[PDB]
From Swiss-Prot, chain A:
Protein name, UniProt field: Coxsackievirus and adenovirus receptor
Sites carrying sugar chains: 87
Comment, domains: The Ig-like C2-type 1 domain mediates homodimerization and interaction with JAML.
Tissue expression from the record: Expressed in pancreas, brain, heart, small intestine, testis, prostate and at a lower level in liver and lung. Isoform 5 is ubiquitously expressed. Isoform 3 is expressed in heart, lung and pancreas. In skeletal muscle, isoform 1 is found at the neuromuscular junction and isoform 2 is found in blood vessels. In cardiac muscle, isoform 1 and isoform 2 are found at intercalated disks. In heart expressed in subendothelial layers of the vessel wall but not in the luminal endothelial surface. Expression is elevated in hearts with dilated cardiomyopathy.
Protein task: Component of the epithelial apical junction complex that may function as a homophilic cell adhesion molecule and is essential for tight junction integrity. Also involved in transepithelial migration of leukocytes through adhesive interactions with JAML a transmembrane protein of the plasma membrane of leukocytes. The interaction between both receptors also mediates the activation of gamma-delta T-cells, a subpopulation of T-cells residing in epithelia and involved in tissue homeostasis and repair. (Microbial infection) Acts as a receptor for adenovirus type C.
Disulfide bond sites: 22-101
Ig-like C2-type domain: residues covered: 1-115
Gene: CXADR
Full-protein residues shown: 20 to 139 of 365
Assembly and interaction partners: Monomer. May form homodimer. Interacts with LNX, MAGI1, DLG4, PRKCABP, TJP1 and CTNNB1. Interacts with MPDZ; recruits MPDZ to intercellular contact sites. Interacts with JAML (homodimeric form). Secreted isoform 3, isoform 4 and isoform 5 can interact with the extracellular domain of the receptor. (Microbial infection) Interacts with adenovirus subgroups A, C, D, E and F fiber proteins as well as coxsackievirus B1, B2, B3, B4, B5 and B6 capsid proteins.
PTMs per UniProt: N-glycosylated.
């Protein structure tokens, strides 16, 4: 299982929307249920690997997770097509940090990091 | 029911001698909103290398993938015959010194997620 988006740094201004890409391709043995998660490790605290969004069992859980609640959502209307990307709206300085996309389609697994910086 | 998906004793150390079998416990309790498909994964971060978070076993879509993952292939398996009952424990047979490291049990039953860490020590 591969995430074809490279690790990169996204820099946007406060108040704008950040698109954090995560596109993936599957290998032949990846026959299990698709599961996608993003995690944040914020620059403003010592917390790491906090879940911000999850697709599992063909359902999306977004605002359920408190970090970035109301502001992080999947961008695609068809995640199964290979697009696990997210948008973070109304960017705040507290959103700065490392975001990790995790894609699983059993037994395959892949992960990729995107760095986000927000400018005043 | 717990308030949120929980694992009993989320951080501990297990010690066993070389050649023996280690039992790594991971017993979980669901909360009422945990209604998605059960998914369980274990990872290893070996003391003897820079690699971290390497998958060693997975239960997903009601199937177990164990030897599929190269780390500890042939030697790591789930111990229970009923994972859905709350038992995500694994065992590692014929322990080698190279097995020393941090093992993470991750349990998901969407939207709930919980993790446990076990430091495994193998004695000569």
């Amino acid at each position: 299982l591969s995430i074809t988006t490279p690790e990169e740094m996204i820099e946007k201004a406060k108040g704008e929307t950040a698109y954090l890409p995560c596109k993936f391709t599957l290998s032949p043995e990846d026959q299990g249920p698709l599961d996608i998660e993003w995690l944040i490790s914020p620059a403003d605290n010592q917390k790491v690997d906090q879940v911000i969004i999850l697709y599992s069992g063909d359902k999306i859980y977004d605002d359920y997770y408190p970090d970035l609640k109301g502001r992080v959502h999947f961008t695609s209307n068809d995640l199964k097509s290979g697009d696990a990307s997210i948008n973070v709206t109304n960017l705040q300085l507290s959103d700065i940090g490392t975001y990790q996309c995790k894609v699983k389609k059993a037994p395959g697994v892949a992960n990729k990091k995107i760095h986000l910086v927000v400018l005043v």
